């Protein structure tokens, strides 16, 4: 069967994944520019990641193209063509684990997050990541290679002068680069503390989600005892374990509904002290206006921006999910190829599936972000319609 048919249709699709890499990321990075909203923190390390995604297109996928000819080059050219991509998708790594943190620090610490952050300490982080990423990807250039152990066999086959190789992937880069330091290191540990670091995100919004409802539980069943209430003694616990909850879910509208509200329970917990019972379940009775005018409302904006912090956690995740996907078969192939020399090796029409499959996460990220942020989503219209 000729070759070049089948070579046919992986350099078609290989083009049309550049075409749609190299425009859906443009946008991205278009959007962010105009807005003035979208210019924040978590999106530096999205612009970040929309950048390796468009350099997938321009430069990762016309050098994959030209590694499956396996043509005359020398064995240092042949690495970087081969090991670009590595670099690509450790910067992808690093962006995706500071959006993960990111996220954390803005749900766990809300008041130090203004502090611990900002616009100058991201772009220090992101230059040091695209230096390691570097550094990571481009490991085999530094002597890790094959270089030293040639295929002599296809050289001459392929008419290639003295000094080059057949410039192929697995024939200049040694497999236990691509499992132990690029897969388990580099790849799969960051990973797994992904998992994690989202673990603790959803955890920690599901605390604060009893919190919120403990307190609006803590004050209604306090208000009822003291209606129903015998003596002063009673009127006296159902106050201080509201009054200890007012001061708990507190934690300039804001300020001024709760200096109603404990005001109003000091003056009815005075009573109880003075013995006044009838009046000091008539004082309390006043907390119901009150509740039902400032607290209510802070019950519905505070659980409000809950669910907008929820929302955009999850969104990221998707997005970490996705690169996993996207890249675990290809990892898969190369622990199959490394650990079981007994086992035929993988067709090349499989080979080409999985490189296909991890070059597609290049296109996925800006479909998630117009089908889930609202604010990037209106932002895409404007920009299309002019
Ligand atoms: C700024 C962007 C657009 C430019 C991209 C640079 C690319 C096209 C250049 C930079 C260095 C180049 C490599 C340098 C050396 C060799 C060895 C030679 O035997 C085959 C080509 C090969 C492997 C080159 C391939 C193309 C290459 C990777
Ligand atoms: C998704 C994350 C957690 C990783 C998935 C687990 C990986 C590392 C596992 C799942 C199945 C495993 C393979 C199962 C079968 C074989 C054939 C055997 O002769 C050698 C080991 C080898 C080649 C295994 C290598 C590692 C492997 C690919
Ligand atoms: C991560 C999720 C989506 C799983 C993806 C499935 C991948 C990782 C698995 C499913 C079945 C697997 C194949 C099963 C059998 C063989 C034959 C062996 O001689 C070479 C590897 C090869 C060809 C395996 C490569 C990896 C493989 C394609
Ligand atoms: C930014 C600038 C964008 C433009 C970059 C140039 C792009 C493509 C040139 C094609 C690459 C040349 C590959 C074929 C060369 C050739 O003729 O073959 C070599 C010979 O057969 C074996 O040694
Ligand atoms: C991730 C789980 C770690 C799994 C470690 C990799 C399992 C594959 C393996 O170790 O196989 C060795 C085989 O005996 C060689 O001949
Ligand atoms: C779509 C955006 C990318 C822009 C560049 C498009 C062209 C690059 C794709 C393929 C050509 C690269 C080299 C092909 C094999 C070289 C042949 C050889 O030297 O034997
Ligand atoms: C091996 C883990 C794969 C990566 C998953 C990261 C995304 C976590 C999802 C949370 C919902
Ligand atoms: C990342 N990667 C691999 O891990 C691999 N294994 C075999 N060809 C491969 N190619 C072309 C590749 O780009
Ligand atoms: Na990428």
Redesign the pocket.
């Known amino acids: 069967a000729p070759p070049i048919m089948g070579s046919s249709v992986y350099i078609t699709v290989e083009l049309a994944i550049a075409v749609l890499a190299i425009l859906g990321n443009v946008l991205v990075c278009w959007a962010v520019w105009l807005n003035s909203n979208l210019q924040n923190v978590t999106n530096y390390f999205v612009v970040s990641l929309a950048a390796a995604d468009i350099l997938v297109g321009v430069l990762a996928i016309p050098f994959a193209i030209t590694i499956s000819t396996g043509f005359c080059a020398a064995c240092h050219g042949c690495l970087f063509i081969a090991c670009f991509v590595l670099v690509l998708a450790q910067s992808s790594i690093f962006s995706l684990l500071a959006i993960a943190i990111d996220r954390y620090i803005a749900i766990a610490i809300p008041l130090r997050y203004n502090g611990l952050v900002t616009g100058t300490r991201a772009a220090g982080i992101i230059a040091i990541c695209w230096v390691l990423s570097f550094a990571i990807g481009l490991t085999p250039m530094l002597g890790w290679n094959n270089c030293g152990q040639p295929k002599e066999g296809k050289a001459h086959s392929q008419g290639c002068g003295e000094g080059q190789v057949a410039c192929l992937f697995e024939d200049v880069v040694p497999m236990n680069y691509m499992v132990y330091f690029n897969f388990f290191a580099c790849v799969?540990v960051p990973?797994?503390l992904?998992?994690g670091v989202?673990?603790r995100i959803?955890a920690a919004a599901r605390r604060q989600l009893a919190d919120l409802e403990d307190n609006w539980e803590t004050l209604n069943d306090n208000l009822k005892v003291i209606e129903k209430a015998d003596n002063a003694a009673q009127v006296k616990d159902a106050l201080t374990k509201m009054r200890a909850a007012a001061l708990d879910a507190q934690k300039k509208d804001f300020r001024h509904g709760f200096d109603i509200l404990v005001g109003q329970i000091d003056d009815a917990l005075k009573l109880a002290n003075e013995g006044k019972v009838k009046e000091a379940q008539a004082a309390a009775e006043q907390l119901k206006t009150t509740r039902n005018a400032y607290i209510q409302k802070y019950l519905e904006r505070a659980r409000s921006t809950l669910q907008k912090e929820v929302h955009a956690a999850?969104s990221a995740?998707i997005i970490?999910?996705l690169?996993?996907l996207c890249w675990?078969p290809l990892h898969i192939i190369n622990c199959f190829t490394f650990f079981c020399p007994d086992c035929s090796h993988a067709p090349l029409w499989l080979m080409y599936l999985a490189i296909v499959l991890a070059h597609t996460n290049s296109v996925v990220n800006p479909f998630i972000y117009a089908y889930r942020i609202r604010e990037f989503r209106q932002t895409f219209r404007k920009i299309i319609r002019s």
């Open positions: 799969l990973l797994l992904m998992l989202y673990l959803f999850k995740a970490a999910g690169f996993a675990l």
